[PDB]
Ligand binder design. Sequence first.
Ligand SMILES: COc1ccccc1CC(=O)N(C)CCC(N)=O
Ligand SMILES: COc1ccccc1CC(=O)N(C)CCC(N)=O
Ligand SMILES: [Zn+2]
Length: 140
Amino acid sequence: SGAIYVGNYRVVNRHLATHNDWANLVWEDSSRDLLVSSTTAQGCDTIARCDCQTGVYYCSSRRKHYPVSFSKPSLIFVEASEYYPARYQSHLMLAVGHSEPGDCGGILRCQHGVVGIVSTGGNGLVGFADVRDLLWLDEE
Ligand SMILES: COc1ccccc1CC(=O)N(C)CCC(N)=O
Ligand SMILES: COc1ccccc1CC(=O)N(C)CCC(N)=O
Ligand SMILES: [Zn+2]
């Protein structure tokens, strides 16, 4: 589990969104596994605006923050799960690292701010849903 809190926005994995998130929906994209809902209180996170490929992510299944190198956001085939059938997930970045299903929502950060959240994994890989292209998160 986990979320990004920037401005009056809450960014979560679309497959983990709550019924309050859906009732207060701002934007969602199934192909990205992302959902953004509105919040009453202001958050403290800053979104990175960069092309960094190195950073640190939080892994709840190890209670550890791991430095990683990750690929640029791209269209990657993701096997069937209890949340989605087998499909192509877009804006996804991969790294060699540990992850388990409940690690989704763990933040990946670089020196500029939040880069994305854990969204997929398996076979010693961890996938992050990128949020750096969502410029509108920084305003209104
Ligand atoms: C100190 O947190 C670091 C540091 C490096 C890298 C990542 C984090 C995690 C983070 O930014 N959180 C707000 C924790 C909640 C979450 N959703 O992961
Ligand atoms: C961190 O996720 C891991 C890790 C290891 C093994 C399995 C998972 C769960 C996982 O990949 N999904 C539920 C897919 C979600 C999606 N974005 O389509
Ligand atoms: Zn950066």
